DNA sequence: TGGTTTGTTTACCTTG
DNA sequence: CAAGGTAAACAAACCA
């Protein structure tokens, strides 16, 4: 009652901006974003395998292609998938 | 090849 | 209504 939601206040926008945030880069791929909240979030320290991600993921992918505050950046490397940032010119 | 990952949208509920 | 969390339909790109 102290908490909007099981992992704190934070909505899923905000736990994304931290973990773009935390990268001396400013930027992070989709599945580096779900290794922070796996490896940062207490939650979801142990909703990390296939069975039980699958939820929250989701949840993540709408996040970041939903809000104009995150940007994707392309990566070729070669199969490599997109760069996500926080949007310089603000949400 | 066929299953998985990444992305984009739209829909549905619930709160405030 | 608006905001968020949660589901889900779809498809291009990946990848085992
Ligand atoms: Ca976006
Ligand atoms: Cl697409």
Do not use: C
Request: proline share 2%; aromatic share 10%; glycine share 8%.
């Amino acid at each position: 009652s102290s908490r909007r939601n099981a992992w704190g206040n934070l909505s899923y926008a905000d736990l994304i901006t931290k973990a773009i945030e935390s990268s001396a880069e400013k930027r992070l791929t989709l599945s580096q974003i779900y290794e922070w909240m796996v490896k940062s979030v207490p939650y979801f320290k142990d909703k990390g395998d296939s069975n039980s991600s699958a939820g929250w993921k989701n949840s993540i992918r709408h996040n970041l292609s939903l809000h104009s505050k995150f940007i994707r950046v392309q990566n070729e490397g070669t199969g490599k998938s997109s760069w996500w940032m926080l949007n310089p010119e603000g949400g």
